[PDB]
Write an enzyme that holds these catalytic residues in place. Structure first.
Site, PDB file in Angstrom:
ATOM      1  N   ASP A 120       0.820  -1.177   0.000  1.00 56.62           N
ATOM      2  CA  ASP A 120       0.000   0.000   0.000  1.00 56.62           C
ATOM      3  C   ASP A 120       0.873   1.254   0.000  1.00 56.62           C
ATOM      4  O   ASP A 120       2.105   1.168  -0.063  1.00 56.62           O
ATOM      5  CB  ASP A 120      -0.938  -0.077   1.200  1.00 56.62           C
ATOM      6  CG  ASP A 120      -2.239   0.719   1.032  1.00 56.62           C
ATOM      7  OD1 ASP A 120      -2.329   1.651   0.229  1.00 56.62           O
ATOM      8  OD2 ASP A 120      -3.202   0.481   1.780  1.00 56.62           O
ATOM      9  N   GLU A 141     -10.949   6.644   4.311  1.00 57.53           N
ATOM     10  CA  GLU A 141      -9.828   6.122   5.102  1.00 57.53           C
ATOM     11  C   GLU A 141      -9.977   6.764   6.507  1.00 57.53           C
ATOM     12  O   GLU A 141     -11.073   6.917   6.992  1.00 57.53           O
ATOM     13  CB  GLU A 141      -8.474   6.419   4.373  1.00 57.53           C
ATOM     14  CG  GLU A 141      -7.731   5.255   3.709  1.00 57.53           C
ATOM     15  CD  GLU A 141      -6.260   5.105   4.213  1.00 57.53           C
ATOM     16  OE1 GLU A 141      -5.882   4.087   4.895  1.00 57.53           O
ATOM     17  OE2 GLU A 141      -5.466   6.032   3.942  1.00 57.53           O
TER      18      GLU A 141
END
Ligand SMILES: CO[C@@H]1O[C@H](CO)[C@@H](O)[C@H](O)[C@H]1S[C@@H]1O[C@H](CO)[C@@H](O)[C@H](O)[C@H]1O
Ligand SMILES: CC(=O)N[C@@H]1[C@@H](O)[C@H](O)[C@@H](CO)O[C@H]1O
Length: 606
Positions: free
Chosen positions: A289, A495
């Site tokens: 990521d 997020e």
């Protein structure tokens, strides 16, 4: 086979494995490490790409050539990068990745599908496959070959800012929605070995099952946090859909920021190499990521040398750097030159990267197809999104008492109606996060139909439609309204910004619902990425619909409100009575839901 200057890896007729091997044996260390390096477009130049033998680029959330850029501008951007990579000694094409997670959502004018939690409410894996198909076309419209989707997190706590990116708290729904994968990539052939990467060709894209593994299981749903569950729970809840991804030939897997019982996934050799590669037999590539390796340490980035060592030895193949590529390449080169990371590891990483590039036809079609530009925002895709939006809607209430006439479906002909609320005429809010910007945005950010616009397109021409964002009680009582549609809910987030302990909607929301419903019968449309505290909304409302984050095609909402189709959606999550109960998932010991997973009222089409 046949000419003076014949190079086997360049021969499109050869088997992928022979091509991979032939290319790999020619490569320098710098050419190898280069493949393993993914950089942001914002730091890419021709020279950077060429001199570092760069393997991949991405656009992160909001990383666009400019605001309002056309499909062709995107293709020209990507082609410009590709031209630089194709001019290296070996001419290895780069693969460009983007988060096309509910359509090709960073792009102006792209069809914006419902977010995954709504899609879960549809219980319709074939619909999701079709959305995969359409998404691939719109991603290719922009020249991009690789989508960081699907997120197959099993969200176990709706306080997580990413719960909307999970199809369900029930792993079985998530598993079923892995049909997105063959949508985006093409169906695998009849023979097919599970774990092999697959992409049908230039009209499809490489997919990404993310984020491996247990991202949906973090304590108090804290984003990027610790997932405290035993191996049995890991394997039972958070793992199964990865196995379905293997069977469907997902091309890449992205690693989670999260930790499993205090071990950082980005440093977890036992799960990345031991399990994903050696037990599930994954043969695609494993990507980090964004700065995921930096985050192995606390503070993040504080020993980047250890971050490279630990990630690469764990079995990661491509690193989403995404900015400081020089430091990444320098450090990794040092580690290899020093014997700390063996060549065998580098060669495995590059073998997997090349396997995916060859398999998907990237060496045969490294450049964009200008004829695909018209796929972007194509009306058929919008009709699909509209279908999905409608199917996503969960009717939670249709009448305040059992003896009340049901409010829904509403008549299209009435002398005068009210449309109200903060979310009635706001395309950005109805799309939620990962739309145009990373965090999403407010207002008319792209091409779409708001709820208000949808209502106006639906009703009889004699119906007078009045909009008032936040009317007072008197305005409603004096208006002469037959009914109101009122739309409220959460603001866009993505997020960590949406990690939320209270789960109550921002005011005015409730106060507007109260003021409208106090004056005229009302259908409340709740726009959210998750269950939110809803008893007060329910108490005020004649009918109430959970519409999630339905995307660009708000006529999906009115199609069900006006009875062109019946409500069919079913909660894909538990609707809690109180945040103090959380986590609380279907099948738990104390299971005391306001509305259980699977709940949904229905109507018939009129
Ligand atoms: C889109 O990148 C995000 O950027 C901010 C800063 O710009 C970072 O703080 C975030 O952690 C990442 S989130 C991360 O991004 C990947 C690339 O877009 C995405 O695929 C993944 O799902 C996210 O976890
Ligand atoms: C393993 C891990 O990610 N731990 C973090 C911890 O370091 C941090 O203090 C906390 C913030 O609330 O969230 C959790």
């Amino acid at each position: 086979h046949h000419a003076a200057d014949y190079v086997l890896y360049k021969d499109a007729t050869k088997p992928v494995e022979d091509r991979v091997a032939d290319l790999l044996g020619r490569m320098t260390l710098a050419e190898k490490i280069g493949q393993m390096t993914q950089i942001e477009r914002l730091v890419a130049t021709p020279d950077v790409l060429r001199d570092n033998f760069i393997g991949s680029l991405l656009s992160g959330g909001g990383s666009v050539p400019r605001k309002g850029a056309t499909a062709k501008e995107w293709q020209d951007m990507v082609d410009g990068f590709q031209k630089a990579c194709m001019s290296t000694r070996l001419g290895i094409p780069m693969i460009y990745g983007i988060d096309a997670v509910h359509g090709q959502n960073n792009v102006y004018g792209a069809t914006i599908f419902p977010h995954n939690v709504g899609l879960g409410a549809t219980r319709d894996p074939y619909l999701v496959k079709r959305i995969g198909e359409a998404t691939a076309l719109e991603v290719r419209a922009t020249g991009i070959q690789y989508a960081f989707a699907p997120c197959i997190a099993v969200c176990r706590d709706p306080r997580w800012g990413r719960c909307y990116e999970s199809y369900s708290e029930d792993r079985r729904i998530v598993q079923s929605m892995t049909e997105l994968i063959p949508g985006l990539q093409g169906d695998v052939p009849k023979d097919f070995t599970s774990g092999m990467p697959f992409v049908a060709g230039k009209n499809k894209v490489a997919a990404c099952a993310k984020h491996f593994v247990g991202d949906g299981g973090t304590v108090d749903g804290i984003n990027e946090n610790n997932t405290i569950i035993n191996r049995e729970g890991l394997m039972n809840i958070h793992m199964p859909a990865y196995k379905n991804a293997m069977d469907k030939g997902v091309s890449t897997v992205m690693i989670s920021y999260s930790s499993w019982n205090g071990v950082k996934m980005h440093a977890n050799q036992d799960l990345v190499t031991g399990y994903l590669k050696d037990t599930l037999k994954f043969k695609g590539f494993v990507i980090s990521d964004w700065e995921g390796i930096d985050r192995i340490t606390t503070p993040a980035g504080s020993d980047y040398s250890y971050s490279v060592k630990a990630s690469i030895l764990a079995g990661l193949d491509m690193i989403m750097v995404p900015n400081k590529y020089q430091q990444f390449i320098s450090i990794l080169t040092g580690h290899v030159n020093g014997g700390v990371i063996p060549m065998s590891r580098i060669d495995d990483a590059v073998t997997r990267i090349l396997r995916v590039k060859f398999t998907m036809g990237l060496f045969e079609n490294p450049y964009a197809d200008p004829a695909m530009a018209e796929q972007l925002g194509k009306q058929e895709h919008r009709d699909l999104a509209r279908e999905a939006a409608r199917k996503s809607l969960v009717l939670l209430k249709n009448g305040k008492t059992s003896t009340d006439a049901p409010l829904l479906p509403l008549p299209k002909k009435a002398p005068k109606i009210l449309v109200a609320g903060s979310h009635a005429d706001n395309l950005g809010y109805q799309c939620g996060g990962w739309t145009i910007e990373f965090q999403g945005d407010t207002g008319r950010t792209t091409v779409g139909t708001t709820i208000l616009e949808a209502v106006k397109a639906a009703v009889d021409p004699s119906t007078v439609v009045v909009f008032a964002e936040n009317p007072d009680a008197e305005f409603v009582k004096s208006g002469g309204f037959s009914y109101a549609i009122v739309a409220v809910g959460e603001h866009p987030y993505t997020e960590t910004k949406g990690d939320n302990l209270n789960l109550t909607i921002p005011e005015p929301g409730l106060s507007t619902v109260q003021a409208v419903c106090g004056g005229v019968r009302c259908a409340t449309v709740l726009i959210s990425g998750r269950p939110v505290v809803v008893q007060p909304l329910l108490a005020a409302s004649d009918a109430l619909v959970a519409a999630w984050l339905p995307g660009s095609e708000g006529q999906g909402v009115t199609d069900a409100l006006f009875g062109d189709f019946g409500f069919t959606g079913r909660l894909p999550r538990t609707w809690f009575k109180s945040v103090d109960q959380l986590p609380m998932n279907v099948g738990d010991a104390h299971y005391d839901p306001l509305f259980r997973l699977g709940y949904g009222l229905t109507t018939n089409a009129t």
